[PDB]
Each structure stands twice: as structure tokens, then as C-alpha cells.
Copies of this chain bind each other. A is one copy, B any other.
């Protein structure tokens, strides 16, 4: 088991979190992309007091994110890809998501558990529903999805590699952020028809992004709504919903799944990719904590076991509801329409 020191260490772990998000917000690592430098000159380039900048630097060094030799701070080469703001794996979006949204809400975790409700009203004075905030801010949603797209590379690679897309004639991805998955499918499967279904607000933007990358004729963008169930998805024998169910309460998950089931072609296949809790709902750790993040931030999001997802597939009308394990962090929940 663990000891008192461990619990204390973890109760203070918001220290390391905010040292990192502050450094990212200050773009501190940017000042070392070209040369090494001491605290006083980093503080000059950042427009910050020398003393407090030095306190942040010493902490980042002690945490292993920076090197320091003879008073000069050095950005390690293997940290460049995620600490520099122009690198495609830059963590700045997550940092600002934490600073502006998740960190304040988790401050009120106790009350979220007491009430089984989000703390957006408490914390931000915002009495709008989760659905309201999302529908109203498609720019934030796009920024979010393009950040997530970077992380989804192992899921996408393992989906393309472990699942036979050659068996299907037409694949449609519901609510793709940026088209990364159907692009990877197109790159490996030249004969399958491909489409993304987007909200009418998000569709022109995704169309523009697909066109810029050269995929505007290869991948169609159709408009629709999983919530209202307006889903022109009947010509697609494979339908995929990427990591969306856990954003909603189970009852809403049922509505989404019934909405897709009703719109699917007869004999069609539907796959939801999710990160389930394990069999005895004992973990894994990040997913267990992700559930709490859904509690404090959304209107009824939650993580579920594989079996719980199977039950919801069946209740929504799907036949042969089953799990398909693939490489990567997601698990496929699969069912057919008969």
C-alpha cells in the first residue's frame, strides 16, 4: 500500500501542474529554443521580474523539464516537440484549458460530488447548459478537436491497422474534429467511400481544412445532428462515433445511439471508440479521473465499463453488440442494424 508521504505528495501535485501551465502560458520555453540563458536574461525576454522568473526556472529545472549548467538554463532536445509553441505537439492549448476552465472547476470537486452536478455556475457565474456553451462556441470546439487530434494518432494508426476497412464500401465519421481518421483510411484503403458528418455550423470550416490538405474530393462533408437525429447517413455501411458518448449522461447516450441506429442502413455496422473503465470499474487511473472531470465540467458526462456500453448498444436496438480491442488507447464498441 501507500503511506502518509505519498498522499501528501499527491495532495500537493497541483504545484507541479501550475508550474507547467504557467511556464506554457508565459511561453517560457520559447526563450530557450535558440540558445541557453541564465534567469536574469530569460526574465528580460519574458518581461518579468528576475526573482520570480528564477523561482519558476529553478522549479522547472528541479522537475526535469529544463537543464541547468553553470547558471545557464537549457531546453532539452527531447522536450522541444511539446514545450515550444510552434511545434506541432505544443501543449499550450491544454495549459490554457486547464488555467481557464478545468483547474477552477476542480477547485469545487467536493460540491460536484455533493450535488452530482457541474460547477460552471458556482465557478464562472454561467448558468447555461453544457450543450448551450458548445453549440454557441464552434471556434472553441474546433480548437479543442484539433488539439485532441494530435493525441489521437495511436488510436487512428491502430484503428486503420487492426480493423479491416476493405470489407466496407462507404465509411462515415460522425463529428470528426479535423478529418484525421478518414484521411488515414483514404491513405491505406483506396476504394472505400468516405464522409464526415458535421453540424451545419462546423461543416464549411472542415470542408476548407480538407480541401487545403488535398482531400476535398476524397472525403465528403455532410451536415447533420446526432442530438436531433437528423443524420443523412443511410448510404454508409460503416459509421463511427469517436469518443463522444462519455461526454453525455447515459440517457442521452441512449438517444444518440437510437438516433444513429434509426438512420443507419439495414445491415449496417456502427462503431463507437471509447476509453472504458475496466471490468470491475477499478481503473484505469486516468480514465477514472477523466470521469470526475466530466462530473465537474459537463452536464452529465461519465465513463462506463465495456459491459455498460454493450448494454446501451443493445437497448438502442443494435444486434451482435461486442467489444473489439485494437492498438492505442481506445476500445471499439461495435454493433449491427438488423
Contacts and interface: CB of A to CB of B under 8 A. Distances in A.
Nearest to A289: B15
Interface centre among A19, A62, A103 (most CB of B within 10 A): A62
Given A103-B14, A281-B58, A291-B59, A114 B7 contact: no
A49 B83 contact: no
A49 B110 CA distance: 12
Contact of A63 (B280, B285, B291): B285
Main secondary structure of the interface of A (DSSP, over half): helix
A216 B107 CA distance: 42
B11 A94 contact: yes
A201 interface: no
A255 to B, nearest CB: 17
A79 interface: yes
Given A48-B113, A116-B49, A116-B51, A12 B17 contact: yes
A212 interface: no
Interface string A73-94: 0001111011100000101001
Contacts of A281: 58
Given A17-B11, A107-B104, A109-B18, A114 B26 contact: yes
B282 A62 contact: yes
Contact of A65 (B7, B110, B289): B7
Contacts of A81: 4
B13 A17 contact: yes
A94 B11 CA distance: 8
A110 B288 CA distance: 29
Contact of A19 (B64, B109, B282): B109
A107 B107 contact: yes
A53 interface: yes
Interface string A50-76: 011101101101111100110000001
10 contacts: A7-B79, A7-B91, A11-B91, A11-B94, A11-B98, A13-B16, A13-B17, A59-B292, A62-B288, A107-B107
